[PDB]
């Protein structure tokens, strides 16, 4: 039958491994959390082989929710366009814990059904600046297939805050959303407009957050980068009308500086 | 390590199996398709044990896309409400094939991390009436966690069609969308308003579809059932304000009759 291999891998290490229609890989990750100090976990993977038919299939499994994606991931534009991305990065949703110190386990499983080998490099990073401190600026890089989000913990005596996010290069377009702390977090392109307050931005954005709307005394600031700059007001490129041929967008990235300040 | 079991199960059979934090089950399904005759596949599963902490995790894997969900699935309402559902049913997205006759494989994997056993019944049904014939009425049942969709093949000489969907009982509310034929199909509640033309309905809806907007000469009619009837105009129930306690909605269902007619 199918050959499944397992490993108890660790954080902060890039594993380069092969896979095919026969091999399925499993990685187990242990993680330590405390109620007072909460910190996020980022799963980032890249593929160094160009395949168009059968992509790699990745699943990240937790105690509560399951996330999954295929890579090279294909996004959508306007007129039936296809953009191909090789590196995908996503931050997991961790529910608030009950006990003071509970060790949390999560799994990453890799598979595919293409008949030929394919190499991927996978790593998990314990994100140090998951929390946003008041009056401090944080600069970070986001692409269309690397959504990010940070947790703001409302402090005592603060009735409302204002989240200000700025960029120097106007393009690409992006969407900045404020959401409650409850799994799951809609950081994908298609579901970023379901709940929360969201603004489309190209260079600057500012959203006012109030505590009465968030009974859990915290929220998530989610940043997503779009593929086509039509919404932000740009001119769409005149790429050939390839209905079933995906074209790469090259190196499209956005550097964003975020600061949460008391109102 | 983790114990993984595998089985080459068949269509039209309900398998009742146990699982825990140690067991992971794999089912392989073979499926036969032809270019002229395309027909959908439905994966339907139920859980007969009541668990609130650690749910069952299900993944359905294809050659192209991967879908995943946790059950009993928790949906969202308006004021931080939680609705729990035990049975989940979903139809897979099958891309149009190239060769005249190609056998397609797809896998269903089941796991969980709860320390106690849990029993699930899983079945796969080859949906006979995946296609919609012109001038014919089809009646079907949908719930909030059982989205459906049917493929309409535009015939020769038809410039445009009109899709008319009706119901007798006004509630629950539902969303009816028309989308192009391209994996994936957004049949979930959070992404049903990304692409395509969609109408919210309670008793009747009608959408006009044109061929010039669909170069592939086919489309998908997707039906989704909401949880709260506020959008359709109903009065929300005065359930207790349970922020972290999910309440079941009972037996909420909608019977819908759909007909696609030439304009
Ligand atoms: C989390 O899991 C990792 C993976 O096994 C543990 O890392 C091992 O720790 C032992 C104990 O010192 C070492 O002997 C091994 O060499 C480590 N493995 C590797 C690959 O370096 C880690 O200890 C676990 N965390 C905790 C808190 O126990
Ligand atoms: C965001 O991306 C930019 C561009 O890739 C990074 O700027 C580069 O940083 C490296 C490492 O310091 C330098 O070697 C390059 O010369 C820089 N290039 C440019 C054009 O500035 C930037 O460091 C990234 N930001 C973060 C936080 O990683
Ligand atoms: C698809 O897979 C099923 C699962 O094995 C196959 O069903 C078996 O078919 C053989 C051949 O007649 C029988 O001897 C077994 O008893 C069947 N098992 C079950 C569980 O049904 C099926 O044949 C496969 N399809 C094709 C076209 O080969
Ligand atoms: C949709 O659901 C209704 C209600 O469950 C089904 O109606 C039942 O059908 C069964 C089987 O024929 C009967 O034994 C029940 O008496 C019916 N109950 C009612 C209230 O009508 C209906 O058959 C379902 N539709 C489909 C296509 O499965
Ligand atoms: C199955 O695959 C695993 C993973 O590479 C390997 O360690 C094992 O030897 C394989 N078993 C057989 C019988 O080939
Ligand atoms: C966490 O913080 C609270 C108050 O901020 C404190 O009472 C508690 O002791 C802290 N937890 C630990 C493990 O120190
Ligand atoms: C906290 O830990 C104790 C023992 O370590 C356990 O009995 C209890 O169930 C834990 N709390 C939760 C909410 O799981
Ligand atoms: C994948 O690579 C290994 C080692 O390079 C090789 O033994 C194996 O045959 C390759 N897979 C296939 C399907 O050829
Ligand atoms: C591992 O689990 C499988 C699935 O139930 C079982 O068949 C097998 O005997 C188990 N192996 C051991 C060593 O317990
Ligand atoms: C499929 O239909 C086309 C025209 O409708 C026909 O030419 C072709 O022979 C059909 N395929 C098979 C396998 O009969
Ligand atoms: C169709 O089948 C033949 C052999 O049966 C194979 O060589 C060919 O690659 C198949 N077509 C596609 C598009 O894969
Ligand atoms: C699950 O059920 C089987 C048979 O009923 C039993 O042997 C096993 O111990 C159960 N699992 C646990 C964790 O007790």
Numbering used by the authors:
A (entry chain A), B (entry chain B): 25 to 287
Manuscript text:
Human SIDT1 and SIDT2 are closely related members of the SID-1 transmembrane family, and have been implicated in various biological processes such as glucose and lipid metabolism, innate immunity, and tumorigenesis. Both structures reveal an overall architecture of a dimeric arrangement composed of an extracellular domain (ECD) rich in β-strands and a transmembrane domain (TMD) with 11 passes, highlighting the remarkable structural congruence.
SIDT2 also contains ten predicted N-glycosylation sites, with all six glycosylation sites on its ECD well resolved in the EM map, along with the corresponding disulfide bonds. A conserved hydrogen bond between S105 residues is observed in SIDT1, corresponding to S92 in SIDT2. In addition, Q113 in SIDT1 may maintain a hydrogen bond interaction with N219 from the other protomer instead of the ionic bond interaction observed between R100 and D204 in SIDT2. Furthermore, SIDT2 features an additional β-strand (residues 27–33) involved in interactions at the dimer interface, while the corresponding region in SIDT1 remains unstructured, indicating a high level of flexibility and fewer interactions at the dimer interface of SIDT1 compared to SIDT2. In the SIDT2 ECD model, the dimerization interaction involves a buried surface area of ~1700 Å2 from each protomer, in contrast to ~1300 Å2 in the SIDT1 model, indicating differences in the proximity of the formed homodimers between SIDT1 and SIDT2, probably due to sequence variations. At pH 3.5, nearly all ECD regions displayed a positive charge, supporting the observed low-pH-dependent RNA-binding abilities of SIDT1 and SIDT2.
